[PDB]
Amino acid sequence: SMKKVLTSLAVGIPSPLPPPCLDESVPHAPKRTPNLSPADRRQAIANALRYFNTADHEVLAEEFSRELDEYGHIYMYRLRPTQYEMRAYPITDYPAKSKYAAAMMMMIMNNLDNRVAMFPHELITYGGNGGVFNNWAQFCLTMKYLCEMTDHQTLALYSGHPLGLFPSHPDAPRAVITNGMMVPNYSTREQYDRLYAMGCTQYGQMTAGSFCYIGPQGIVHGTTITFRNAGRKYLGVEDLAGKVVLTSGLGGMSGAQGKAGVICGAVVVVAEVDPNALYKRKGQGWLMEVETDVEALLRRVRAASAAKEAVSIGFLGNVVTVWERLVKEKDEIVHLGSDQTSCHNPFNGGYYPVQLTFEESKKMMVEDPAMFKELVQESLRRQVAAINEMSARGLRFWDYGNSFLLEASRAGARYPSYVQDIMGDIFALGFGPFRWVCTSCLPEDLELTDRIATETLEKLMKDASTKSQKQISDNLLWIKQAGENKLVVGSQARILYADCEGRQTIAKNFNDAVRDGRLKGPVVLSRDHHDVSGTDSPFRETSDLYDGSSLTADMAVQNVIGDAFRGATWVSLHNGGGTGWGEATNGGFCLVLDGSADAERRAKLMLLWDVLNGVTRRAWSGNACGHEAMLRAVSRVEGLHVTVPQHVHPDV
Amino acid sequence: SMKKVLTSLAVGIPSPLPPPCKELDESVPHAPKRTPNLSPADRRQAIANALRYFNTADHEVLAEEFSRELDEYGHIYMYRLRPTQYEMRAYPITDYPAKSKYAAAMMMMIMNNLDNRVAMFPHELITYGGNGGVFNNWAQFCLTMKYLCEMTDHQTLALYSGHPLGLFPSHPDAPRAVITNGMMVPNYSTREQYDRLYAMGCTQYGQMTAGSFCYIGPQGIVHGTTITFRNAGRKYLGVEDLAGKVVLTSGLGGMSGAQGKAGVICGAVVVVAEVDPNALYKRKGQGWLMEVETDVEALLRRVRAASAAKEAVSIGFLGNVVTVWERLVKEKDEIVHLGSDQTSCHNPFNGGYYPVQLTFEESKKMMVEDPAMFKELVQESLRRQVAAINEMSARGLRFWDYGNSFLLEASRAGAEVWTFRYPSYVQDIMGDIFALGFGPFRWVCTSCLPEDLELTDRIATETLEKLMKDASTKSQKQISDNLLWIKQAGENKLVVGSQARILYADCEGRQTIAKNFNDAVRDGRLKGPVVLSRDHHDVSGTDSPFRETSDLYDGSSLTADMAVQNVIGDAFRGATWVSLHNGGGTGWGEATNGGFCLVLDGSADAERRAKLMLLWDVLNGVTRRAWSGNACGHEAMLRAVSRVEGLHVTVPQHVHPDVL
Numbered sequence A: 001s002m003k004k005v006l007t008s009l010a011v012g013i014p015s016p017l018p019p020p021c022l023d024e025s026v027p028h029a030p031k032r033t034p035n036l037s038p039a040d041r042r043q044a045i046a047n048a049l050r051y052f053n054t055a056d057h058e059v060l061a062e063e064f065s066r067e068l069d070e071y072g073h074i075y076m077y078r079l080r081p082t083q084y085e086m087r088a089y090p091i092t093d094y095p096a097k098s099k100y101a102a103a104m105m106m107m108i109m110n111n112l113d114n115r116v117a118m119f120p121h122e123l124i125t126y127g128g129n130g131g132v133f134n135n136w137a138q139f140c141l142t143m144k145y146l147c148e149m150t151d152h153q154t155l156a157l158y159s160g161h162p163l164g165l166f167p168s169h170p171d172a173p174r175a176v177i178t179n180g181m182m183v184p185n186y187s188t189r190e191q192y193d194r195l196y197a198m199g200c201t202q203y204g205q206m207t208a209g210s211f212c213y214i215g216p217q218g219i220v221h222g223t224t225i226t227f228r229n230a231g232r233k234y235l236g237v238e239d240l241a242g243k244v245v246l247t248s249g250l251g252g253m254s255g256a257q258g259k260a261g262v263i264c265g266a267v268v269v270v271a272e273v274d275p276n277a278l279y280k281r282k283g284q285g286w287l288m289e290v291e292t293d294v295e296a297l298l299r300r301v302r303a304a305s306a307a308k309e310a311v312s313i314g315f316l317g318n319v320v321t322v323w324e325r326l327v328k329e330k331d332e333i334v335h336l337g338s339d340q341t342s343c344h345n346p347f348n349g350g351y352y353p354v355q356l357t358f359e360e361s362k363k364m365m366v367e368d369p370a371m372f373k374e375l376v377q378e379s380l381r382r383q384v385a386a387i388n389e390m391s392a393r394g395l396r397f398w399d400y401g402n403s404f405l406l407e408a409s410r411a412g413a414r415y416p417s418y419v420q421d422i423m424g425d426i427f428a429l430g431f432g433p434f435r436w437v438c439t440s441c442l443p444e445d446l447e448l449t450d451r452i453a454t455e456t457l458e459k460l461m462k463d464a465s466t467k468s469q470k471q472i473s474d475n476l477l478w479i480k481q482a483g484e485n486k487l488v489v490g491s492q493a494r495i496l497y498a499d500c501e502g503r504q505t506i507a508k509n510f511n512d513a514v515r516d517g518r519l520k521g522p523v524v525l526s527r528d529h530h531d532v533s534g535t536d537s538p539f540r541e542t543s544d545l546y547d548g549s550s551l552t553a554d555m556a557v558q559n560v561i562g563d564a565f566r567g568a569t570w571v572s573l574h575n576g577g578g579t580g581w582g583e584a585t586n587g588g589f590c591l592v593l594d595g596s597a598d599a600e601r602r603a604k605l606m607l608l609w610d611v612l613n614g615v616t617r618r619a620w621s622g623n624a625c626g627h628e629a630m631l632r633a634v635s636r637v638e639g640l641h642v643t644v645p646q647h648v649h650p651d652v
Numbered sequence B: 001s002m003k004k005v006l007t008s009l010a011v012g013i014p015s016p017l018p019p020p021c022k023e024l025d026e027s028v029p030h031a032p033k034r035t036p037n038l039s040p041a042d043r044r045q046a047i048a049n050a051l052r053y054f055n056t057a058d059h060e061v062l063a064e065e066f067s068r069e070l071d072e073y074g075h076i077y078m079y080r081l082r083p084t085q086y087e088m089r090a091y092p093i094t095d096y097p098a099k100s101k102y103a104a105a106m107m108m109m110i111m112n113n114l115d116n117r118v119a120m121f122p123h124e125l126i127t128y129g130g131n132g133g134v135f136n137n138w139a140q141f142c143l144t145m146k147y148l149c150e151m152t153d154h155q156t157l158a159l160y161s162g163h164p165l166g167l168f169p170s171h172p173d174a175p176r177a178v179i180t181n182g183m184m185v186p187n188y189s190t191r192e193q194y195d196r197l198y199a200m201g202c203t204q205y206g207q208m209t210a211g212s213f214c215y216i217g218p219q220g221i222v223h224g225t226t227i228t229f230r231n232a233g234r235k236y237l238g239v240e241d242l243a244g245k246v247v248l249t250s251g252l253g254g255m256s257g258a259q260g261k262a263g264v265i266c267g268a269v270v271v272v273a274e275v276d277p278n279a280l281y282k283r284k285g286q287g288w289l290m291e292v293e294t295d296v297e298a299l300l301r302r303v304r305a306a307s308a309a310k311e312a313v314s315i316g317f318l319g320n321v322v323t324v325w326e327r328l329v330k331e332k333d334e335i336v337h338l339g340s341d342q343t344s345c346h347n348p349f350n351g352g353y354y355p356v357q358l359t360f361e362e363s364k365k366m367m368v369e370d371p372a373m374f375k376e377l378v379q380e381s382l383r384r385q386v387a388a389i390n391e392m393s394a395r396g397l398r399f400w401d402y403g404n405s406f407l408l409e410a411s412r413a414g415a416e417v418w419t420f421r422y423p424s425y426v427q428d429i430m431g432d433i434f435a436l437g438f439g440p441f442r443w444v445c446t447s448c449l450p451e452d453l454e455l456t457d458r459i460a461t462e463t464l465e466k467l468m469k470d471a472s473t474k475s476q477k478q479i480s481d482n483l484l485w486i487k488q489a490g491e492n493k494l495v496v497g498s499q500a501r502i503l504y505a506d507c508e509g510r511q512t513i514a515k516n517f518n519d520a521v522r523d524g525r526l527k528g529p530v531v532l533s534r535d536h537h538d539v540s541g542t543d544s545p546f547r548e549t550s551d552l553y554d555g556s557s558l559t560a561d562m563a564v565q566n567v568i569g570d571a572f573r574g575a576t577w578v579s580l581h582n583g584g585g586t587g588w589g590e591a592t593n594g595g596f597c598l599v600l601d602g603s604a605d606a607e608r609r610a611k612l613m614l615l616w617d618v619l620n621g622v623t624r625r626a627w628s629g630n631a632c633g634h635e636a637m638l639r640a641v642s643r644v645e646g647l648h649v650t651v652p653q654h655v656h657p658d659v660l
């Protein structure tokens, strides 16, 4: 929970302190190994003690020293609230002055929900170390500030640390977030571990530190769109019904490949060596069927293809086994191929060789590392050679940004990559993540927004360009099936892709519905940082740009600054979202739609910039796919006037 | 140049193109040949990148032309596009063909940074630091001026390390421009990638004020050194008056050359030794040096007299600073009270430091003839210099490191720098000054009239005198230092290019001066709007483990949260334009620095924006530095929290080390 129990959120650091504590009902983060020197370890304790009354220092010093020895990190477990279930509550349940701050508090608690976060009690949402706060004192103080702040104040968050409330104005963001911002030369993984333990920084991933993670439905949608575009670009079909997709991995992100294929109406085959990962997804419903022998698999796949059934079929075994079996098959069975093994970690648990069993590999990778790498590289060569033979017979393969072709290249090996071949063109058009959360926590509101988003995209597609109408159709297919796929976890949220006008129109319609009373609560707009403008990442988000600027971070910095004075309720700039610490600069936003004309104006203005910034950059950096879309925007939007690149053809 | 000739600023890329640059204007100095060592592919891409700015119809000729520029200069400046129909300089704001006076002001600031009188390598778009650039090429300049001429107050120009991405819709309170320079994906921010991407036209190094269009000349260094001497005087001598006090230092080079004037403004006796007659006699001719001595014996007799008569005088010694130090050891009299060193010991073997054993000409010779022997003599001279300093220190002389890596390089030479036994001004002094909120307050009179600058000097003077009353003991001292400066600033004739001025002021100081300026613009006492700005050497704008955040020992000095937070916070609080740079001060990849400019036009909007933005731009870093463990920041933070409505920050509780 009620509004009574949530009054504690305004307390901050309780006086006197709560009793000391480990709750093993949830998964816990692995022990951190910062390897702090005696000097840094003393500083780490001192830094942590900054949050507490001096009268508590002596006992907390031993307590925090204990946490470092046992967990490798000072989480301050005794400050984690236990009098209520950590989750998103109705926005009207929060004892806050500002509805905007209340919305943020709701978003934060969702990131710390046991059902949502990876390591909830360690304040880790996803990605192993994609954190929300460095410790539970920062949580308590931030929540206190958010309950206390007005709309003429702005909360400054230094990698989890609430620096304090500073004067601003209603149109200003209520919070500015920076996670892991480093002086460029000191952004090593070693300095992360060190400074994370010393309480001077944290890794916020993308939506972990920016308070807008909503579960794995983003990956399901993402893979769905990827499959659809792959079908059009590589096969030439606007419909994947009857088409077979062979892929691998049922892990964190790759586990979504099953539902994605089904939603596309395709027969999707996912190979997984790990029975744990495979039967998990099977039990979850993300995997419809399971096959053990490859011969029975192909018979099943043949019958599925001919009957045009939307089905996900897991194969308990190595993906190389399936690939090499198809080579011995004189008949065409699989039309599309990919791979989502973790070849970014090829020799230590990410890739399992065909020569060994799952258990034998798990043993050899640490027992005989040299032998394991040799078998992996050999297995990689056998996989590519099989794909080559099948590609020559009509099959179309693409790399799913998992460094499969890169590692295969580094052993001996022509195929496109999802980031550089299909997503880059989608970003260039302006289509990217459009995420929203109904702050009423009512499923009815989510149902309505689903229908509103559907109705909006339908009318937009009728007058959209031929390129856009294909992207819009992809997201229409998704939003109509999204609800029945039961992907909602924690907060009532949804995700799709939309270009500039798509996001603007849906937002305005959402905002009208909040004002009309159809929506019983305001709606927070947000997105992943896997977007057109938000992230500079030479290995991913900007890997398709070949002017050389993929190593620069001008765009990401420009974008977050541009969002901040255009009406975002809060913004964030992170280090190494996606590809990893030091390898990316990623930023995002959240904007609360409360039905006011202000919110509509903010949304229209901000979303315009958040899309056309990257669209213009990507065009300037060599992407020609959205060049016409850019020029239409320029003609359509008053006040928009950009430098139009005249790209010389490399041959000429 | 009249308002008619400046209409060419609205053109952007001329159609048809102006004639190709046949020769080269030798009336100005030119940047050294760049060496990116581009691969065949990167070189091809560099040319393709440059061609993006031009009609495809001109690509045939420009390709070879830009290729030629690569082979000759190591960079594609696009010399063809450099305007030659007018003198590049700041012109009165009314001369510019802009819809927006805010944009017109930015154009004025831009052209000042490119003034032959101001810029180091003007035709290479470099203002200072050797490669601290304004734009990557002249196309970026032309388009930027085009956008600024045409833009309204409802648009914002996004500048990507020189590249004007375009005008995007915003609102009157939004920045008219957002500037980034050298922003990199962290693991790729190497000096090699800078050289590579600079040539490829993907990035540039903007230093601090070079890329942010707000460099105003060498009066920043003069003021900076004035403040340093004053604080060194108070902290190391315990005196508020340096009259009769003697400062010994070295170097009359680029920045070190301001030590002469700084000492005089402090009313002290400053002795600056310099082996290079080029630097020394230049300073003499510039009036930055009042006197010149040749032998050390006649020097010390002169210094004695000046000290006894409390004469404010700068005295240059043509010779080695070591020669003076060792002579002081033999002199029984107390002559010098304060000692420092500003030789370039960050490059002690490449001409930054000249040993005592050799003459200036002898040193230049074996600098390339016998590097091994030279390095031995340098390290030997370094040990002797410290040995002499140690003896004078034992006799009451107070020495400090000027952040030139003197003590660091001496330590590597095996000099007795331990019991460092001498404090570094950056970590010992400036950190506390920043923590109080005091830092660069800079303004430009857009009328380009000296009369306006005189008035702003008087307004600033009167303002600081009034703030003396209700200020803390610590802040009263800093205000006094800037009062001594501002009353003498005009007569020192430090203005080059635009009518500009710089001083240090804390939160309320910057706010009140801004408000008084804005009142004067509205009343008509000032003939034109005033652009507020600052160097990035400030309290909140820069994360730099070697400098601006070097006195923070909580471990966070490696982080860049504060700098990123600051520029964002300024951006939605009414800044006219903001900048976030990579590598300001210390160098590429070694710092993250941000800045702002804010135009005062007399309106309620400007007054409101100034009050709010300046509050954040100061108190952000004050609060951080307090949190990171600075005691001065802690005290200033608490006073602000009590004074400012809407200000509520996290107060750090410091544990006793005995508990650890």
Ligand SMILES: NC(=O)c1ccc[n+]([C@@H]2O[C@H](COP(=O)([O-])OP(=O)(O)OC[C@H]3O[C@@H](n4cnc5c(N)ncnc54)[C@H](O)[C@@H]3O)[C@@H](O)[C@H]2O)c1
Pocket: A219, A222, A223, A248, A249, A250, A251, A252, A253, A254, A255, A271, A272, A273, A274, A277, A317, A318, A319, A320, A340, A341, A342, A343, A344, A350, A351, A352, A353, A354, A400, A401, A402, A403
């Ligand atoms: N949207 C996306 O899905 C996306 C986006 C960007 C990058 N990626 C990349 O995709 C990869 C997968 O991501 P994840 O989170 O699912 O990783 P993960 O480690 O959780 O899952 C990989 C799975 O593949 C299985 N596997 C390994 N070798 C196999 C083999 N030979 N045959 C069958 N199964 C095998 C592993 O057992 C594991 O379950 C990563 O490399 C990631 O960088 C994915």
Ligand SMILES: NC(=O)c1ccc[n+]([C@@H]2O[C@H](COP(=O)([O-])OP(=O)(O)OC[C@H]3O[C@@H](n4cnc5c(N)ncnc54)[C@H](O)[C@@H]3O)[C@@H](O)[C@H]2O)c1
Pocket: B221, B224, B225, B250, B251, B252, B253, B254, B255, B256, B257, B273, B274, B275, B276, B279, B319, B320, B321, B322, B342, B343, B344, B345, B346, B352, B353, B354, B355, B356, B402, B403, B404, B405
């Ligand atoms: N505000 C400041 O002044 C400031 C700020 C930051 C850093 N620094 C540091 O200060 C140093 C000086 O900067 P600069 O721009 O003046 O450089 P500079 O190279 O132009 O000046 C150094 C001068 O010292 C002279 N010199 C060298 N060895 C000498 C010796 N033994 N005796 C006498 N003279 C000698 C050189 O001939 C030269 O003229 C640099 O190391 C710089 O990093 C200064």
